[PDB]
Write an enzyme that holds these catalytic residues in place. Structure first.
Site, PDB file in Angstrom:
ATOM      1  N   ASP A   4      25.051  63.452  -2.345  1.00  0.00           N
ATOM      2  CA  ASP A   4      25.940  63.859  -1.263  1.00  0.00           C
ATOM      3  C   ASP A   4      25.523  63.062  -0.032  1.00  0.00           C
ATOM      4  O   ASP A   4      24.495  63.359   0.585  1.00  0.00           O
ATOM      5  CB  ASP A   4      25.861  65.361  -1.017  1.00  0.00           C
ATOM      6  CG  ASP A   4      26.873  65.833   0.000  1.00  0.00           C
ATOM      7  OD1 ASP A   4      28.083  65.772  -0.297  1.00  0.00           O
ATOM      8  OD2 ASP A   4      26.460  66.259   1.098  1.00  0.00           O
ATOM      9  N   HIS A  23      52.268  74.399  -9.698  1.00  0.00           N
ATOM     10  CA  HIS A  23      51.735  73.089  -9.351  1.00  0.00           C
ATOM     11  C   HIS A  23      52.753  72.021  -9.734  1.00  0.00           C
ATOM     12  O   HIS A  23      53.100  71.884 -10.912  1.00  0.00           O
ATOM     13  CB  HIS A  23      50.395  72.854 -10.044  1.00  0.00           C
ATOM     14  CG  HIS A  23      49.310  73.770  -9.571  1.00  0.00           C
ATOM     15  ND1 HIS A  23      49.067  74.998 -10.149  1.00  0.00           N
ATOM     16  CD2 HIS A  23      48.417  73.647  -8.560  1.00  0.00           C
ATOM     17  CE1 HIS A  23      48.064  75.587  -9.521  1.00  0.00           C
ATOM     18  NE2 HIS A  23      47.651  74.788  -8.554  1.00  0.00           N
TER      19      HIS A  23
END
Lengths: 126, 1048
Positions: B11, B557
């Site tokens: 990260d 969706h």
RNA sequence: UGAUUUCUAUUUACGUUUUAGUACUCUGGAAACAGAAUCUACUAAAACAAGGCAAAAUGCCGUGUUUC
């Protein structure tokens, strides 16, 4: 003032009580001078304990953008990082009571415990 | 440690790099940590460069003055007995145009001309206007110098207005040269001069360095000749290291971006959905070369389609389609339309390079002519006056043309072409690299923030590889914010939209009476965006039915998540439950082209178009989702969706990925690297039920790492994800299984596999970057003068400016609170009484001097009996008492007052143990001086500060602490911030896993958020610990004596 | 939930401070003038991160990166 005059360099810090801000000044360039003050409990080398009001001035804190309510946090952050990397000790005056030193910082110095509070109270923002 | 079969999650943030190590087969958390560092800022190097340039300017001014002095000593016009104190240079300068001057006043005139010699070219001055540009001021002054010399105008300004210096004192070198040579032709009849004297002085007066000459011999910033100047200005290509980087606005770069735009278009038509070679050529020739800024209308008219049929274009913030414009092509075409010029790509490249790297019209003309080309002299004249050519391209022209071929003859864009070609950085031989090189990051055209974090991430990867062996998979996520300002911007916008949604929900509850809306915010927002319409049946969705029976309606969706991987609002529509049920794993185009639908596809398309037109209730992403007419069973469409919603395709991420994958490719190391889209990880982190607030320290950065590591695990466990797994890894994919329903998608991704085990992890490690760099800022900028008061203290003198500004109330505050701090209060009481009168007259005003000036036209003048007192512009007053400082009074000889600078910046502090008591001495930045290879602590200043702290000669040196070193005081481990109060032996520290501020906030503590400690007799133990880049602790071992020599 | 600008060159007029001169203020004097104060301003000459090189030279470096 209700201060006491002492020998000041052999003083041990016992408890940091408060941190107030007295002035946030714009130098009309990209920089700011932040005046703040600390309220500590301290023990003298002789044994007696006083309450230290120590004033500090952090100069040339660079901030180019106009500060808003959405911005004062970043100015406080930059002031902190400028203060940590430099020298800002001015003087320390001592009291026998915590109430007396708090009254000093409250009225004769006009200190707020929030950077945002001081910015709005001195007029840097709203 | 012991080598492992593991996944490594990274990260990369602006101030942190979190790493997570998960076992590849057991999914157990092997390790996790964060590397913490300060956010880089371009303003640091900016100030460094600006101050270096200012020092150069001042040095060259002084050197010019001294060279004129030497010339004067040569011709005996200056001796060691010459005295020029009382000479007025303006009077002497105008007198020397008509009469003989004293050798003394002649020397003074030449020197005063040499000090201020005017402008050569305005392009050399990068200026912020006193509010009237130097070019305009030179125009004014030269128009005023039509029958005068500079000295004459300056002298009449002095005699009339009393001033010469300021904004209006900006002339150009030509006028000074005229005055000087007339003065010389007059004075040569009275002084034994030469023509060589005149030539040398005029040269000294008018000569300066050019942008392409650079600093003199011996400079690390200089160059040997013009070729090295050009090569250092441009830099070398990453993939072809002996090639130089192209300029940004070369013709071929614009053509490259334009072909990239054209290859991204998806045209709905009976023919190929992608533009073909002949079609792209026709569009470039007939639209891009005929229109300065091509529009979607012109492109659609060229291929004889309608605007709604073309999709996949870049967009402005006004929603208008954006396309690359050939800048240099239309810049030269407006001057000459000749085919021999504008249809010569290399010629336009050369013209763009010359316009970019040269900063003068004359030099541009010369370098254009030196191109033995077909351009006429008047064409070159007109071209030399063009503007807007800045910047260097990422690629060389060689790579640009190599990719131009692929752009012309394929429909891939730049990202796809680079992913297929897989070019290797060759500036460093990755073949002979024992670890991932960090120097390649210095080449990238990137923000210093992302540069620093990329270098830190590379070093974290290197350390993890050395500790646990080569990883199986590496998954990386880069933060979205570019800096702290961008982070605050995003925080403010998110708080704003949360406030607005809360308001709408609250007033929905007020109007309708039911609190159900509190738990239906997504469906309610979708209802709002769709204007209460189910977009698949176009029937009305009554808000009352939605609020009462919300399961009659479902969030469908648009593009199935098994292919789209999109969990955001852009891929969601509030439809009727039956519509969603009948739609299945299809697109609106497929469902409404079917027997199962209730309406046509064209009714739906018309509705969607008119709904997108108005008030931005549809996002462009949502509109191109709803009108997706491609077969999502095609592998190309699935690859496109994976590259959009699953991969991070930002330039910085792509560069880091290319570097890593190249290093692994070259050394034949089988490490699969992928960079995940942050929207997907946000979706995963939310569905895995991680808290929204991050209020328990830096461990979150490591947590995220583990999270994405966990995500990587998923993509390896299921074969039906293989395609995605191979697109994220940029691997060529070969009866394949596939996620067939959305329930299967949620089973694959929402199922909290090992999430509690990740939340139960407690062995986090932290690494803080220590700063040992010498020769940082040594002292503040402000130059102060001081006074000595009656009681023997030294007060600093501050200046008050802008006395007549509308908003400056500081002087009013000072006069009302503490008048005695003003120096005029004690040393000019009558002027202070004038000022107090003015202050009380307009006391109800914020700045009484401002209103006084507006009402009277008068400033505050010094008190006078004949009212001839000078205008007061700034007021001196007493500041604080002078504590520790830098005394620079020696630079000003015979100064009655001490001249100081403030805030001696500290470098480190050395802790000694002296007969049982811990002491420490502060090493300041001023105490470290560079000696010819290495930085040395000045032993005299060091022993001085040691004695000031009463440190014995037999005192045992314990350690030295810099910023962020790990200190252990009385058994508690902190990180060192720095010296807080040297006199009081007070240092400042902070916690390691979290900042003290948030630690206090979590307990709702109002204590000062700074850990200040005293080091004195009460101190029992002081130890030093340090960590590696991964946060693995080790106590610092040795160094009986402090370090005096530093590498730097 | 809703997409690269780093690195680097050249220069002008400012700005802060000190010294000197002048102007302004005060004292003494008929005047010539001289003191006091160093506040406000103009002009010139210098210094402007501490400092280090280098020796007539369009001379060079000194607040960045990296800190395991």
């Amino acid at each position: 003032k209700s201060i006491e005059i002492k020998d000041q360099n052999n003083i041990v810090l016992i408890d940091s009580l408060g941190q107030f801000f007295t002035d946030i000044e714009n130098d009309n360039n990209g920089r700011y001078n932040i005046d703040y003050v600390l309220l500590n409990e301290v023990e003298h080398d002789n044994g007696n304990t006083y309450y230290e009001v120590g004033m500090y001035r952090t100069e040339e804190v660079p901030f180019s953008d106009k500060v808003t309510q959405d911005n004062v946090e970043l100015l406080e952050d930059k002031w902190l990082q400028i203060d940590q990397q430099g020298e800002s000790y001015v003087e320390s005056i001592f009291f026998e009571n915590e109430e007396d030193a708090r009254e000093y910082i409250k009225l004769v110095l006009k200190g707020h415990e929030t950077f945002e509070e001081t910015a709005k109270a001195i007029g840097v923002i709203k | 440690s012991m080598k492992r079969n593991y996944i490594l999650g990274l990260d990369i943030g602006i101030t942190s790099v979190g790493y997570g190590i998960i076992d590849y087969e057991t999914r157990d958390v092997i390790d996790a940590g964060v590397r913490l560092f300060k956010e880089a800022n371009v303003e640091n190097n900016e100030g460094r460069r600006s101050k270096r340039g200012a020092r150069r300017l001042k040095r060259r001014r002084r050197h010019r003055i001294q060279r004129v002095k030497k010339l004067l000593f040569d011709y005996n016009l200056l001796t060691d007995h010459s005295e020029l104190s009382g000479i007025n240079p303006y009077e002497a300068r105008v007198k020397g145009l008509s009469q003989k001057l004293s050798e003394e006043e002649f020397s003074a005139a030449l020197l005063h001309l040499a000090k201020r010699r005017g402008v050569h070219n305005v392009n050399e001055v990068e200026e912020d206007t006193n509010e009237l540009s130097t070019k305009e001021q030179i125009s004014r002054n030269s128009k005023a110098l039509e029958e005068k010399y500079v000295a004459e105008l300056q002298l009449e300004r002095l005699k009339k207005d009393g001033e010469v210096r300021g904004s209006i004192n900006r002339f150009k070198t030509s006028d000074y040269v005229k005055e000087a040579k007339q003065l010389l032709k007059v004075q040569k009849a009275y002084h034994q001069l030469d023509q060589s004297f005149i030539d040398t002085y005029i040269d000294l007066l008018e000569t300066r360095r050019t942008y392409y000459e650079g600093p003199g011999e011996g400079s690390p910033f200089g160059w040997k000749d013009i070729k090295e100047w050009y090569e250092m200005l441009m830099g070398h290509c990453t993939y072809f290291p002996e090639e130089l980087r192209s300029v940004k606005y070369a013709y071929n770069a614009d053509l490259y971006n334009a072909l990239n735009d054209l290859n991204n278009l998806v045209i709905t038509r009976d023919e190929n959905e992608k533009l073909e070679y002949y079609e792209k050529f026709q569009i470039i020739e007939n639209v891009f070369k005929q229109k300065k800024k091509p529009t979607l209308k012109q492109i659609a008219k060229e291929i004889l389609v309608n605007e709604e049929d073309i999709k996949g274009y870049r967009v402005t913030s006004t929603g208008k389609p954006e396309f690359t414009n050939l800048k240099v092509y239309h810049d030269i075409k407006d001057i000459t339309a000749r085919k021999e010029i504008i249809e010569n790509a290399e010629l336009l490249d050369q013209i763009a390079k010359i316009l970019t790297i040269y900063q003068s019209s004359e030099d541009i003309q010369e370098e254009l002519t030196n191109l033995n080309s077909e351009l006429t002299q008047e064409e070159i004249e007109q071209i030399s006056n063009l503007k807007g050519y800045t910047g260097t391209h990422n690629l060389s022209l060689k790579a640009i043309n190599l990719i131009l071929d692929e752009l012309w003859h394929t429909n891939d864009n730049q990202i796809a072409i680079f992913n297929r070609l897989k070019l290797v950085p060759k500036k460093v031989d990755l073949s002979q690299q024992k670890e991932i090189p960090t120097t390649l990051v210095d080449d990238f055209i990137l923000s210093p923030v992302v540069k620093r974090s990329f270098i830190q991430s590379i070093k974290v990867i290197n350390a993890i590889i050395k500790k646990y062996g080569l990883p199986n998979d590496i998954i990386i996520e880069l933060a979205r914010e570019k800096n702290s300002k961008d982070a605050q911007k995003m925080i403010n916008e998110m708080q704003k939209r949360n406030r607005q949604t809360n308001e709408r929900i609250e007033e929905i509850i007020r109007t309708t009476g039911k609190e159900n809306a509190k738990y239906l915010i997504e469906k309610i927002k979708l209802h709002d965006m769709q204007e209460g319409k189910c977009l698949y049946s176009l029937e009305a969705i009554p808000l009352e039915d939605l609020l009462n029976n919300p399961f009659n309606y479902e969030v469908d969706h648009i593009i199935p998540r098994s292919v789209s991987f999109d969990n955001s609002f852009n891929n969601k529509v509030l439809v009727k439950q039956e519509e969603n049920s009948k739609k299945g794993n299809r697109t609106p185009f497929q469902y409404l082209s079917s027997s199962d639908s209730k309406i046509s596809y064209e009714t739906f398309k018309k509705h969607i178009l008119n709904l997108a037109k108005g008030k931005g209730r549809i996002s462009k992403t949502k509109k191109e989702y709803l009108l997706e007419e491609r077969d999502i069973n095609r592998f190309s469409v699935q690859k496109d969706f994976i590259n959009r919603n699953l991969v991070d395709t930002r330039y910085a991420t792509r560069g880091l990925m290319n570097l890593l994958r190249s290093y692994f490719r070259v050394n034949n190391l089988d490490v699969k690297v992928k960079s995940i889209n942050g929207g997907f990880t946000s979706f995963l982190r939310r569905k895995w039920k991680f808290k929204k607030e991050r209020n328990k320290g830096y461990k979150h950065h490591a947590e995220d790492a583990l999270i994405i590591a966990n995500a990587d695990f998923i993509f390896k466990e299921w074969k039906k994800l293989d395609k995605a797994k191979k697109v994220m890894e940029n691997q060529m994919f070969e009866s394949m299984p596939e996620i067939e329903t959305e329930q299967e998608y949620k089973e694959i991704f929402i199922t909290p596999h090992q999430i509690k085990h990740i939340k139960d992890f407690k062995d986090y490690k932290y690494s803080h970057r220590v700063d040992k760099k010498p020769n940082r800022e040594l002292i503040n900028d402000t130059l102060y003068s001081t006074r000595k008061d009656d009681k023997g203290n030294t007060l600093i003198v501050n200046n008050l400016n802008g006395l007549y500004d509308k908003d400056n109330d500081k002087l009013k505050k000072l006069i009302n609170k503490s008048p005695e701090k003003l120096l005029m209060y004690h040393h000019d009481p009558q002027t202070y009484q004038k000022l107090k009168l003015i202050m009380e007259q307009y006391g109800d005003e914020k700045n009484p001097l401002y209103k006084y000036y507006e009402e009277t036209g008068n400033y505050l003048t010094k008190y006078s009996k004949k009212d001839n007192g000078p205008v007061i512009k700034k007021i001196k007053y007493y500041g604080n008492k002078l504590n520790a400082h830098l005394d620079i009074t020696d630079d000003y000889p015979n100064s009655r007052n001490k001249v100081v600078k403030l805030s001696l910046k500290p470098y480190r502090f050395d802790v000694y143990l002296d007969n049982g008591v811990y002491k420490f001495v502060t090493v300041k930045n001023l105490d470290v001086i560079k000696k010819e290879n290495y930085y040395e602590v000045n032993s005299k200043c060091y022993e001085e500060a040691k004695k000031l702290k009463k440190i014995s000669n037999q005192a045992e040196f314990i350690a030295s602490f810099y910023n962020n070193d790990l200190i252990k005081i009385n058994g508690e481990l902190y990180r060192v911030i720095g010296v807080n109060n040297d006199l009081l032996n007070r240092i400042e520290v902070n916690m390691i896993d979290i900042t003290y501020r948030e630690y206090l906030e979590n307990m709702n503590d109002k204590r000062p958020p700074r850990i200040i400690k005293t080091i004195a007799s009460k101190t029992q133990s002081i130890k030093k610990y340090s960590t590696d880049i991964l946060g693995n602790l080790y106590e610092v071992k040795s160094k009986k004596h402090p370090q005096i020599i530093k590498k730097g």
